Ligand binder design. Structure first.
Ligand SMILES: Cc1cc2nc3c(=O)[nH]c(=O)nc-3n(C[C@H](O)[C@H](O)[C@H](O)COP(=O)(O)O)c2cc1C
Ligand SMILES: Cc1cc2nc3c(=O)[nH]c(=O)nc-3n(C[C@H](O)[C@H](O)[C@H](O)COP(=O)(O)O)c2cc1C
Ligand SMILES: Cc1cc2nc3c(=O)[nH]c(=O)nc-3n(C[C@H](O)[C@H](O)[C@H](O)COP(=O)(O)O)c2cc1C
Lengths: 352, 352, 329
């Protein structure tokens, strides 16, 4: 497998073009893995088109100061209201794999999420992170010992939250058709994808929350009753996601699901939103709709493919800068102002 | 007429591609007959796009066991909540014609529907069925003797229900432009498509229900008042269908009609739903919307074209497996759970 | 020295609302308030009653020749009309023959008796009144697993054919039940378990997933939560979510044959009757309670004729007129 290895800054004008550019340097199989989604990708398209359902108004300013994109989540101050989503196998995009991603995220000044299915050996990731905050993403194992193992690993690696992914990564079914050091460290000699439950229950959430010693986000929530159940089971955060349309097909665009969840959560726990964030305007819309931060996924990996850590950094830089402009135009001085924006309801949808 | 004759399993990744693949092996005239629909096919397109109007939510599991797709209808246990729709002239797709279809359905473990316009001679069908359950589809003859004849035939052939099709198969009018052993057995020497009424009435339904000695499904229902009238006339089931858009043009997509019918039927009799089922997600949505089972039509015939009974079996296998995955993602352990799913209302339609 | 009525006689029931007032004349004040009252200032009890005006019946042409037949069946038991007796505590507040009187009325009429956890009659006394007729046992969730096991064993040995697990305590018992409780009861009962007090569709789905064999849509006659919807307003959403998985019993506010029809049209298999049967009991013992069941059956027959319905299944198929104006129209 010959992943790109060049490290360089890139002039990111938009994130959509990064996909096609990346397709030129990433081996076809790995590229398809990263870019593809369930079915005929109609729900991935829905993730993207959902942003046109609620539109931004320009508004007069009410404050004199320059815009400030910084925010805090779980008591940690970060440079802008976006974090890195947990994504498996960054080596499919770049030889520096998760270490490169971590470097970009740490240098930028936000939170790195580490997939249990990382191709890098934490020590490798740690060198990219250089002290930066990190959250650990897990799947629910059928074997309770394996959950104990990964929770221990996460605490040892200095994780400050656990991301409990609700859906099993068999991959999800598409119409079209490395090792895993972190888990192999604990599965070795056991002979145990199929090791995890296909879907978690409130009881699973309670088990993980009770034993992690850390706040647990439940990731993959798209229905408000699941958010309420998860919080009652002991979740410390709700991560609204459809995993970039990689799981359930003929489901809504993730952004359409956010307000009903935010209204039901009603401030009880922080909300992370993802699945389809491509522009600064999307970050603003998520915050206006109830998210505390958003997670970024595919665009960062395409950046990684194109320039290693500097290419990934350029993508985070693009989002921060684009968000600043959206703040100016919406009359927003800070991230809290964005949470107060009125959106225009577009009943016409994408074609207008 | 040179229909395909090869028997083989196929790797079914999606059912849409089976159409185009089939177009390569089926003679053009026969292929057009199977694939085509009324007008410019706008209502066939509507059948397909209707599935995007109600979207699936992923939901937390509430039960520990592996998903079980089995269900019961009319007291017969079947492997998954789908049956074979009555389709004329399977010989247009494959030399093993209805016998091949029957073999696939019987081996899979569901119900075979036999079209009155079968190209095979029941004895041929019977050898494929090998004891498997079968329902008999009839049209309402103008001549009452001919109805007596076919009802006798059905009872003799061990049918456990009658499917009374409400609309006469003159074909339906398109913008573009074998024998029938089962009916010829009774029409011989009579000199009698035009032998049947163009449309049935409640009085017809009552006549058939009174004399069949078997539960009668009325097939082609798209309006709730017709469902109520049919039940009052003695129907034992409602089969919601527009016959794969082969009859009335500039009518709604079949799935859009299902909830109003299900609400009016209100549990009185079982509901079979068809017209446009292409994915596991569609089976789930139909059940969530009030159907007890769905019927499969064109995809099975395309499978038949491509691999005889094994090709048709591969299609049923695809639906069963895809449904299992949808059950996992929706937190559903069984077919009853699917009937309880909440769907997301998408007011935007296909383009989102 | 509680002086409950003791006369046994048939009564000419023209409407059930007048039974409350008439009953107030013969039942001791304290007992009467207990029966007739509800939470808060009774706004939710009034909501139970006014909710029937939100969906209105249409007269319709007939499509069959035969006279109306009210018979139905639930859980394989054939009953005379689509209503059963709700579980109500302490019938001795209404009449000296207490639950034995009510049981006699229900069995003579030909429907199912529900026996409250707080019955004032002994089972032997009730058994005599039932004379073999079907009965369901209503229980609360005990905090002690062994007490639950004992109650479930007693019920099945007493010939119960279903258990009604009431989700809310009025009053050893849990105040509110959870899915786990439902599962524990369903797992050990050996009988279909109805979960009673459901008003929200998500609870119906959870209950069924936990092993309930029936959903009993109720707010216990507005006796529990105040400033909640009228029970009938909650029924369609629940019926749509249940989607035929298990039978639905509906109660809380049924007073007319039109209400029985509207409940069936909206997804209930049967309804349960409560206060009106007890007012009948106060007024005439088992014969007075019987007269109330007879009123509902005859009044439903008239409603069937007018709606063009020959049988209980036809009622399940009625279209209702949506009245967005509500009570004052
Ligand atoms: C290549 C790929 C691998 C992923 N692997 C995981 C995974 O290991 N665990 C997880 O919780 N989510 C995983 N995700 C989903 C992401 O965390 C995130 O929800 C998604 O990328 C956001 O959608 P977007 O990238 O289209 O904006 C993966 C996504 C992709 C693109
Ligand atoms: C080639 C063809 C022939 C058909 N012949 C009959 C028929 O004989 N009787 C009948 O009731 N329906 C007939 N149908 C309709 C099917 O029973 C069923 O309603 C339809 O195939 C479902 O639509 P779908 O196949 O697009 O999912 C036919 C459909 C097609 C494709
Ligand atoms: C006096 C009184 C006592 C009741 N006791 C019980 C009880 O023991 N257990 C129970 O599940 N419900 C109990 N209920 C509620 C009834 O089962 C039923 O839900 C209610 O009477 C129906 O409302 P309605 O009578 O106004 O039409 C009681 C209701 C009343 C009026």
């Amino acid at each position: 497998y010959n992943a790109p290895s060049e490290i360089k800054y890139i002039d990111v004008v938009n994130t959509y073009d990064l996909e096609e550019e990346a397709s030129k340097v990433v081996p076809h199989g790995g590229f398809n893995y990263i870019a593809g989604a369930s079915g005929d990708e109609w729900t991935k398209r829905a993730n993207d088109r959902a942003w046109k359902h609620k539109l931004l108004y320009p508004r007069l300013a009410q404050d004199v100061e320059a815009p400030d994109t910084s925010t805090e989540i779980l008591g940690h101050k970060i440079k802008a209201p976006f974090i890195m989503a947990p994504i498996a196998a960054h080596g499919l995009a770049h030889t520096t794999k998760e270490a490169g991603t971590a470097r970009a995220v740490s240098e930028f000044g936000t939170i790195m999420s580490i997939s249990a299915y990382s191709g890098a050996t934490f020590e490798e990731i740690s060198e990219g992170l250089n002290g930066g905050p990190r959250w650990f993403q897990i799947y629910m194992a059928k074997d309770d010992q394996q959950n104990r193992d990964i929770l221990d690993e996460a605490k040892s690696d200095g994780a400050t939250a656990i991301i409990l992914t609700a859906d099993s990564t068999v991959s999800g079914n598409r119409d079209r058709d490395f090792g895993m050091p972190i888990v192999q460290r604990y599965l070795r000699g056991t002979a145990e994808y199929g090791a995890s439950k296909q879907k978690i229950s409130p009881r699973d959430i309670e088990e993980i929350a009770g034993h992690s010693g850390l706040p647990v986000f439940v990731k993959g929530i798209q229905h408000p009753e699941d958010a309420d159940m998860a919080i009652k089971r002991g979740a410390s955060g709700i991560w609204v996601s459809n995993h970039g349309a990689r799981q359930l097909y003929e489901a809504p665009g993730s952004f359409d699901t956010l307000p009903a969840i935010a209204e039901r959560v009603n401030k009880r726990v922080p909300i992370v939103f993802d699945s389809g964030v491509r522009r600064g305007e999307h970050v603003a819309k998520a915050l206006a709709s109830g998210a505390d931060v958003v997670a970024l996924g595919r665009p960062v990996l395409f950046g990684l493919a194109l320039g290693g850590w500097q290419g990934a950094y350029s993508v985070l830089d693009y989002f921060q800068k684009d968000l600043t402009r959206v703040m100016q135009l919406t009359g927003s001085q800070n991230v809290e102002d964005l949470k107060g924006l009125d959106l225009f309801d577009n009943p016409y949808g994408y074609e207008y």
